Every structure is written in C-alpha cells, then in structure tokens.
Design a protein around this ligand. Structure first.
Ligand SMILES: [Cl-]
Length: 180
C-alpha cells in the first residue's frame, strides 16, 4: 500500500477565512485482496523525529486517529471501519469519481460517489493541525486528484459554500511507496 497527496494544507487560523469548506475529487483510472481509500489527513499525525522534526508517514488512510478515509462501503479512522450507504453501492473501482468534503466550521468530513451523497459522515473529531487531501492504494491501482485548476477540473459542482482545494496552493504531488 502506497499513498499520494498534493501539497495543499487547509486549516484554521486567526486570519481572514472566507472559505472554511473545502472540496476535491478523486478519479479512479484503473482497479484490477486490494486497498483503495480516499479522504483527508492531518499534520498532527506526522511521525516525530529527533530535534522536533515531523514527517508524513504515507500510511493507509484511516489507519490512525489523524486520517479519515472512504472505500465505497466504509468510513475508516483509527483502523476501524464504519458502514455507510449509498446508491449503486460498491467498493471503489475503475471510473468512479469520489467527491471529498472537509467542513472546518462544523467540523465534518463527508463524501459523494459519482455525484450522489454517501449516507454517513465523520463528525465529533478534532481539527488540530493542517488537513491535506490523501489517498492510499495497493499495487497497480491508478488514481488522479482533481483539485480544481485548469489541469484537474471537477466532474461535479462543489456543494454551496465549498471552495476548490486548488485555491489553497501557496502544485506538486507526493507519492510514498515501500522501498523494499
Ligand atoms: Cl506504486
């Protein structure tokens, strides 16, 4: 299991914050046991290093208390699966488009699948740190972030009040993979 993320970091501050609600999509270009989870993680989940260093771990989305993932059937956090429902329900597969929503004002993390709402969302979790889009996947799986911006246009309209993640570009994708 590998992971990818863009360099987009969203969070609370004491400055101007016209947008507290953030949206992106993931397109699944190819799927062939397997793993494919998408959602968000916080920098509070970084691994500590000597001298105060903190590093992204690149682990499975929802396999700790700092990340929040959807796989088509379940929501994941803290290594535990919650069952959710949707129309036409399936584990993620080729040509699925997953919408990911982060509402820092609620707080909530919620999803759509091929434009339809997933019934069940994350609530009652902390919003310490900065949040980033993130996906994790087993071998051979091909996915793309659609962040907004001319090279990653959305397939669906963001919900009212939501901003494209591309607007928070202060754009690169990082991929973490096992070495061995
Ligand atoms: Cl890979």
């Amino acid at each position: 299991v590998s992971s990818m993320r863009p360099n987009i970091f969203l969070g609370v501050s004491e400055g101007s914050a016209q947008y507290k609600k953030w949206y992106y999509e993931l397109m699944v270009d190819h799927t062939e046991a397997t793993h494919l989870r998408v959602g968000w993680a916080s920098t509070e989940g970084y691994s500590p290093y000597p001298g105060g260093g903190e590093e992204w771990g690149g682990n499975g989305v929802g396999d700790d208390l700092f990340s929040y993932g959807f796989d088509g059937l379940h929501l994941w956090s803290g290594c535990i699966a919650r069952t959710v429902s949707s129309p036409n329900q399936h584990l993620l597969r080729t040509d699925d488009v997953i919408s990911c929503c982060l509402d820092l004002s609620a707080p909530s993390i919620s999803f759509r699948i091929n434009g339809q709402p997933v019934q069940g969302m994350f609530e009652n979790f902390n919003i310490d740190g900065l949040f980033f889009p993130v996906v994790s996947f087993s071998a051979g799986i091909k996915v793309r972030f659609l962040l907004g911006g001319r090279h990653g246009e959305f397939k669906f309209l963001p919900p009212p009040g939501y901003a494209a993640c591309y607007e928070a570009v202060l754009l690169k994708v990082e991929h973490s993979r096992e070495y061995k």
